[PDB]
Structure 1
Amino acid sequence: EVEETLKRLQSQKGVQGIIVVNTEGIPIKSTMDNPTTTQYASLMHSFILKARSTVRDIDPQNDLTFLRIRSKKNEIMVAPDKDYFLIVIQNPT
């Protein structure tokens, strides 16, 4: 469940970049390179943490089950994990 599954999950039917954040803000580990991981998931993670800080200001630990932001050309999903948050770019259709 590592090599063939890594290819199966990165270039999955819809998944553009499964850029898993490493320590909730600095995305390093991923199934691909570090620029697409760090830059994309870090800025989207920071700005999504600001929006979550607002929703968190409304109700604090009402976190997201799976924030499926179905953006037009490629969705942005935010699923908060323990050590990090999930900032993955995956197309809607």
Structure 2
Amino acid sequence: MAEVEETLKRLQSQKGVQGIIVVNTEGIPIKSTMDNPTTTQYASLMHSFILKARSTVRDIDPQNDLTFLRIRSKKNEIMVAPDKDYFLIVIQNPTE
């Protein structure tokens, strides 16, 4: 718990980070640091993107690196890291 939380706080220790959220497909985040309605809504949105990306991967190659898939867009480098038990979605910056 505290190990994963410290790892998240270290990866998001970069200044200006939009938000690093340990997430879930259930529409709520495992560990987020944003506004609660926005965090739950973005958790559901990332759940939808995660299901679509999982189907896309299984269509392309069903044995790929299916534990993380970032979105390094200019707005937020959305580092989705869906684990096997939990999940993560880190809307991060393009710098660090």
When normalised by structure 2's length, the TM-score is 0.66
Q: Give the deviation of 1:6 after TM superposition.
A: 7.4
Q: Give the deviation of 1:50 after TM superposition.
A: 0.9
Q: Give the deviation of 1:38 after TM superposition.
A: 1.1
- Describe the superposition over 1:3-42 as per-residue Cα deviations: whole angstroms up to 9, x where unpaired: 9987666563342111221465432542444223211122
Deviates more, 1:65-74 or 1:19-28: 19-28
Aligned pairs (5 A) from 1:9-88: 10=12, 12-22=14-24, 25-27=27-29, 29-64=31-66, 66-88=68-90
In structure 2, relative to structure 1, the CA distance for the partners of 1:7 and 1:19 (3 Å cut) is closer
In structure 2, relative to structure 1, the CA distance for the partners of 1:54 and 1:66 (3 Å cut) is closer
The structure 1 segments of at least 4 consecutive aligned residues displaced by more than 4 Å after TM superposition are 1-11, 22-25
RMSD: 3.2
Residue correspondences, number: 93
In structure 2, relative to structure 1, the CA distance for the partners of 1:14 and 1:66 (3 Å cut) is farther
Unmatched runs of 5 consecutive residues or more in structure 2: none
In structure 2, relative to structure 1, the CA distance for the partners of 1:18 and 1:53 (3 Å cut) is same
Do the aligned partners of 1:69 and 1:76 also contact (CA within 8 Å) in 2?
yes
Unmatched runs of 5 consecutive residues or more in structure 1: none
Taking the aligned partners of 1:63 and 1:8, their CA distance within structure 2 comes to: 23
Do the aligned partners of 2:24 and 2:88 also contact (CA within 8 Å) in 1?
no
When normalised by structure 1's length, the TM-score is 0.67
Do the aligned partners of 1:19 and 1:31 also contact (CA within 8 Å) in 2?
yes
Do the aligned partners of 1:20 and 1:88 also contact (CA within 8 Å) in 2?
yes
